[PDB]
Amino acid sequence: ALPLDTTWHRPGWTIGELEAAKAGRTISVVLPALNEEATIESVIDSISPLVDGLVDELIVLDSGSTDDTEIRAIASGARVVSREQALPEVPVRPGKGEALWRSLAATSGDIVVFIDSDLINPHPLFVPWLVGPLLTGEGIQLVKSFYRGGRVTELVARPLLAALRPELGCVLQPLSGEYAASRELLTSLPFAPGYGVEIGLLIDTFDRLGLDAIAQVNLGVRAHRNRPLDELGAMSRQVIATLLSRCGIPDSGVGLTQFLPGSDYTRHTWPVSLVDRPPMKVMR
Amino acid sequence: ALPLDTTWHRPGWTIGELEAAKAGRTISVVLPALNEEATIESVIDSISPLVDGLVDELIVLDSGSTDDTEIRAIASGARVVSREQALPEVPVRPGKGEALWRSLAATSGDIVVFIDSDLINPHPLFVPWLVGPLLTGEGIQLVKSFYRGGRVTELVARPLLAALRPELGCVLQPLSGEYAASRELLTSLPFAPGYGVEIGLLIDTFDRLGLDAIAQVNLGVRAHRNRPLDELGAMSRQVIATLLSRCGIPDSGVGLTQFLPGSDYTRHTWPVSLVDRPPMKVMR
Ligand SMILES: O=c1ccn([C@@H]2O[C@H](COP(=O)(O)OP(=O)(O)O)[C@@H](O)[C@H]2O)c(=O)[nH]1
Ligand SMILES: O=c1ccn([C@@H]2O[C@H](COP(=O)(O)OP(=O)(O)O)[C@@H](O)[C@H]2O)c(=O)[nH]1
Ligand SMILES: [Mn+2]
Numbered sequence: 001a002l003p004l005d006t007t008w009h010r011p012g013w014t015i016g017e018l019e020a021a022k023a024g025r026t027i028s029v030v031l032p033a034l035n036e037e038a039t040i041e042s043v044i045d046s047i048s049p050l051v052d053g054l055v056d057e058l059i060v061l062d063s064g065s066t067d068d069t070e071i072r073a074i075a076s077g078a079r080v081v082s083r084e085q086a087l088p089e090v091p092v093r094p095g096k097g098e099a100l101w102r103s104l105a106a107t108s109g110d111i112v113v114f115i116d117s118d119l120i121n122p123h124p125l126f127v128p129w130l131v132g133p134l135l136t137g138e139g140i141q142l143v144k145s146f147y148r149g150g151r152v153t154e155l156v157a158r159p160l161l162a163a164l165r166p167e168l169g170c171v172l173q174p175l176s177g178e179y180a181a182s183r184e185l186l187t188s189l190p191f192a193p194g195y196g197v198e199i200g201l202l203i204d205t206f207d208r209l210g211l212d213a214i215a216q217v218n219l220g221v222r223a224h225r226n227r228p229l230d231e232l233g234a235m236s237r238q239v240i241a242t243l244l245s246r247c248g249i250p251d252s253g254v255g256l257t258q259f260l261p262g263s264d265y266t267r268h269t270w271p272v273s274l275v276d277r278p279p280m281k282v283m284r
Numbered sequence: 285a286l287p288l289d290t291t292w293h294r295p296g297w298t299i300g301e302l303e304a305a306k307a308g309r310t311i312s313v314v315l316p317a318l319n320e321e322a323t324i325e326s327v328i329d330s331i332s333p334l335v336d337g338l339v340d341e342l343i344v345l346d347s348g349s350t351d352d353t354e355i356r357a358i359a360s361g362a363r364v365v366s367r368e369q370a371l372p373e374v375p376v377r378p379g380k381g382e383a384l385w386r387s388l389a390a391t392s393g394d395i396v397v398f399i400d401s402d403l404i405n406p407h408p409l410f411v412p413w414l415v416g417p418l419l420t421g422e423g424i425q426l427v428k429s430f431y432r433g434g435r436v437t438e439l440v441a442r443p444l445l446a447a448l449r450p451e452l453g454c455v456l457q458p459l460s461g462e463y464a465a466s467r468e469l470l471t472s473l474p475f476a477p478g479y480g481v482e483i484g485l486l487i488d489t490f491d492r493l494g495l496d497a498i499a500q501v502n503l504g505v506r507a508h509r510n511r512p513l514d515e516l517g518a519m520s521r522q523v524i525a526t527l528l529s530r531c532g533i534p535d536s537g538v539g540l541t542q543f544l545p546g547s548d549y550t551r552h553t554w555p556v557s558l559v560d561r562p563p564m565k566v567m568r
């Protein structure tokens with residue numbers, strides 16, 4: 001009844017069904033990580049039992065961590081790839097979108113699944129639930145998750161989509177870090193910088209293929225860190241910059257400034273970026 | 285050091301100084317109210333000692349209350365004016381902006397001060413602090429407050445201003461319900477509907493007169509009700525619609541829809557409006 005293929009309840013496919021449906025296609029899983037020493041092993045362990053079965057390849061894309069992220073991921077049996085190793089001829093820029101774009105050069109699956117490394121005890125069926133529509137559907141190229149407060153999501157991204165791309169009003173979690181897509185789709189799209197990467201991918205997929213190429217699946221419940229409001233302010237600024245650009249509206253490029261009370265106030269300006277990485281295809 | 289006249293500490297003007305500075309100008313205070321029976325008397329009592337002195341006129345603009353708002357405001361000695369009485373030839377529309385626009389026809393002060401009726405024990409100097417720059421300055425026509433978490437303000441309005449009107453990046457509380465302005469300015473501007481009214485007035489003032497006509501004053505600390513996230517979602521949608529329109533960007537007019545978990549979800553669509561009230565001047 002939503003114009004977007006939506007799975008409201010627990011998917012019924014068995015792991016053995018999903019594997020049969022692969023039909024020669026491979027599956028890579030990428031966990032981007034910046035300083036997630038507390039949660040990274042729980043995330044890797046939720047998925048590693050699938051490896052050499054449903055999942056052909058699993059990597060941690062380490063995004064500059066200075067804690068114990070890398071040593072703990074290695075002790076959980078994961079292949080860890082730095083931003084530099086993924087694509088060593090090209091100097092590294094900051095932010096999540098850079099990490100995800102680089103991960104395309106360090107994987108080879110026909111299907112790529114992204115799962116954030118800050119999840120607290122994620123369900124082991126996340127990955128099977130995300131790949132279902134790509135495997136058993138026709139024409140699905142991108143699958144977004146939703147789940148059971150998403151302040152940026154409910155105050156910024158969903159209302160801006162209603163304003164500027166109302167056809168995507170049916171997407172419940174447009175900014176979700178858990179999703180899967182075909183390599184063919186991902187290497188044909190630019191990747192927005194920083195926290196803009198998810199909203200950019202969704203609007204670009206829709207603008208290029210329409211709703212029929214996109215599905216969303218209920219993952220039930222998900223837990224993670226709640227960042228402080230000021231960090232959310234910078235994140236929201238970058239989401240806004242990427243969304244305005246995809247909708248053809250010129251963004252000033254001026255970073256958000258904040259005034260912090262100590263009354264007595266101090267000022268801080270956060271970076272925003274208007275520069276995308278190009279489709280990974282051009283790097284061939 | 286901000287390009288906008290900003291008073292960072294407690295203003296030094298005495299009530300007797302402010303009165304002398306009036307020089308024949310009058311001052312009206314308007315408290316818009318929709319179902320504020322718990323807080324309305326505290327707000328009125330914070331200001332009524334100024335009446336017949338600094339303040340020439342005080343009204344409660346009752347915006348359709350069905351609780352005890354009106355009887356309690358009357359028992360505090362306030363003149364209460366319904367939306368219908370303010371302008372009886374014109375049928376009433378919903379939302380805050382309608383209430384404020386109508387209040388211009390029910391007052392006659394050269395200066396108009398707005399104070400929200402949901403404040404918990406507001407300081408009795410709010411009104412003197414807001415009128416200071418209009419009275420003692422030159423060329424100030426609008427004064428915004430700021431104070432010591434404003435989720436819509438920090439995630440939606442300030443980052444959209446940085447994107448689309450970065451010159452207003454120095455405004456700390458663009459959505460503040462406590463502000464004062466000349467009647468000449470207010471009756472020359474359209475009024476946005478619903479919760480869009482503050483952002484519309486600020487962008488219009490700036491677009492028409494530039495920064496030199498706007499000041500902001502520290503009111504210290506303010507307290508009020510924290511609305512639930514879904515109501516904030518609709519509010520944010522209307523703020524976005526008004527801000528895009530003032531910046532010349534076409535808004536779809538499609539209301540925000542929300543999916544509420546009961547997993548099992550239900551859907552609800554909130555109204556958004558693209559129709560302003562015209563400058564009150566046309567009603568002469
Ligand atoms: O430059 C970055 C920023 C984020 N992340 C990862 O992307 C996900 C989303 O980051 P977020 O800040 O939302 O989570 P948190 O920082 O609170 O742990 C997490 O797995 C981060 O480790 C990343 O790999 N590179
Ligand atoms: O249609 C409306 C909506 C709001 N208000 C008033 O405008 C202020 C801001 O409303 P808000 O919803 O932000 O406060 P709350 O509803 O939580 O009390 C308050 O004094 C409301 O009573 C109004 O007069 N008419
Ligand atoms: Mn997170």
Ligand SMILES: [Mn+2]
Binds near residue numbers: 402
């Ligand atoms: Mn309020």
